[PDB]
């Protein structure tokens, strides 16, 4: 997860590649002067601003995915593959609308989640903490995630 430290950690590591591109084969000579340090500092601050300022959509879709995933008792392993739709949909569909309809994309990624028996590959079986076995279908949980994201938006 990201918290506090993550922004600083992304900030720190831009310095090397930025001072590389400012002065290409002159590192030792150029980097000595304080001015270039000031400028390259000042530049490497705006890139993190663009990154963090323009990442909220993905984080909020990721946020919405979690509580819906938890309510079915989904184990940790599949939570990431469920996390897929969050930004597979809050990027291609709602912000810019690449030329596709929703249902065909729903079918497409379901063509990536299959079983391959030759079991219910669309309704997995899971074991809970109390030992109560219960099952969930991917189709309905996916329908819930897109319409929930649309209402949230």
């Amino acid at each position: 997860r990201l918290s506090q430290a993550s922004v600083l950690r992304y900030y720190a590591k831009r310095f090397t590649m930025n001072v590389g591109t400012t002065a290409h084969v002159l590192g030792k000579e150029v980097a000595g002067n304080p001015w270039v340090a000031k400028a390259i500092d000042k530049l490497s601050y705006q890139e993190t601003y663009n990154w963090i300022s323009d990442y909220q959509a993905s984080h909020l879709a990721k946020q919405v995915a979690k509580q819906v995933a938890e309510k079915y008792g989904i184990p940790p392993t599949f939570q990431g593959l469920l996390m897929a739709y969050a930004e597979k949909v809050v990027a291609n569909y709602i912000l810019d609308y690449k030329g596709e309809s929703l249902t065909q994309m729903h079918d497409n990624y379901l063509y990536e989640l299959m079983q391959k028996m030759p079991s219910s590959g669309y309704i997995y079986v899971f074991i809970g903490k109390d030992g109560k076995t219960h099952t969930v279908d991917m189709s309905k949980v996916l329908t819930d995630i897109e319409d929930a994201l649309l209402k949230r938006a």
Binding site: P75, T77, F78, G80, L81, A91, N92, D96, K98, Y109, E112, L113, M114, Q115, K116, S119, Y124, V125, F126, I127
Partner: protein, 199 residues
């Protein structure tokens, strides 16, 4: 959307990427000479352990995995071929029955797990000499793997983590594919390496 499609694999230059980045970090730490010398021995162990075992196993199992449960989400299953190497073989820490009982709960139906855990041993026995004699002269199959492989773990209790580590290959005898009479019959990459090296 659709910025790119990153791929992760061993790509004939991982050695130099790793060495260079960890030399850049440690040059301030100890001084130039020690830093330059250190990363060689640092990477040699990784090359001897990861590359010679896990890479070969994964490259063997890729085809049958895509055939068996091929999809975008082979992720939950990819860790099984990795787990069977460490916990069951080379340490005897966990019984095969225990792993089968555990990992079903995540939802993968038994047949694939039985096939994978058995198929891993067949390839692994050829690679690591120490496993072969302990396993004996037998052929693993999903029909009898759950009965046979856990027999050894029942007989021998949990081994220490040293055996998974550096003590692995040094004390055991074998022959490189160079010899003339063993199975072996060396791969061709040792020729492209020379051809590059000549200039």
């Amino acid at each position: 959307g659709r910025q790119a499609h990153r791929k992760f694999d061993v790509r004939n230059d991982t050695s130099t990427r790793w060495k260079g980045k960890l030399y850049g970090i440690f040059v301030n730490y100890m001084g130039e000479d020690y830093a330059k010398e250190f990363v060689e021995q640092a990477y040699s162990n990784y090359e001897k352990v990861f590359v010679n075992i896990y890479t070969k196993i994964h490259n063997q199992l890729r085809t049958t995995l895509t055939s068996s449960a091929g999809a975008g989400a082979t992720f939950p299953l990819w860790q099984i071929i990795n787990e069977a190497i460490y916990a069951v073989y080379l340490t005897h820490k966990e019984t095969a029955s225990f792993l089968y009982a555990k990992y079903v709960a995540r939802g993968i139906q038994p047949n694939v797990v039985k096939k994978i855990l058995a198929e891993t041993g067949n390839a692994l026995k050829g690679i690591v000499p120490a496993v072969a004699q302990e396993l004996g002269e037998t052929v693993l199959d999903e029909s009898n793997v759950i009965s046979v492989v856990d027999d050894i773990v029942r007989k021998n209790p949990a081994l220490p983590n040293s055996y998974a580590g550096i003590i692995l290959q040094e004390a055991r005898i074998s022959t490189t594919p160079h010899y003339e009479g063993t199975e072996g019959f060396s791969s061709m990459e040792s020729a492209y390496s020379a051809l590059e090296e000549i200039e």
